[PDB]
Amino acid sequence: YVPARSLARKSVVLTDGTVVGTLYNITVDFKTGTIVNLLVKPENEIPDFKKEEGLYIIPFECVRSLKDFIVVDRR
């Protein structure tokens, strides 16, 4: 289990090692409690994630760990 504030502005990286950016916020469903997206402040140019308001929209389905580095995959 992870508290949300302890993820504040952490770095987000791909499976290979690319630095994707710093976490900006987290999208959630308030009734269901499902986590929907990550919103990452960009630093590199990965084409694997679409964009809105200049943030990467990473589906939480693609997150694979959340320790000292947020680790993310294309699928």
Partner: protein, 92 residues
């Protein structure tokens, strides 16, 4: 319904009987189930919670509504034990 996690921060929590619970301090997540696990509460109501922790965690399943405040199921009550030779029930 769907929104950003920062919204929880600082929100006051009440029960569905109108009773103040406290202010959200943090949100507890779970990667395995892709879901919010609980809410970390502080400035919490002593009349309702017997505890000395800085904050307490409410499981997310008791959350009923998130609006301008968070409403949860009122669970700050005492059950009464049944007595075999008494129609009344006991509270300890």
């Amino acid at each position: 319904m769907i929104g950003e996690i920062t919204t929880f921060f600082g929100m006051r929590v009440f029960t569905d009987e109108g009773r103040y619970v406290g202010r959200v301090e943090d949100v507890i997540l779970d990667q395995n189930t892709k879901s919010i696990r609980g809410l970390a509460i502080s400035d919490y109501n002593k009349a309702l919670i017997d505890s000395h922790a800085k904050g307490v965690i409410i499981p997310y399943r008791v959350v009923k509504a998130v609006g301008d405040i968070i409403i949860i199921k009122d669970l700050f009550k005492r059950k009464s034990r049944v007595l075999d030779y008494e129609s009344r029930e006991l509270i300890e």
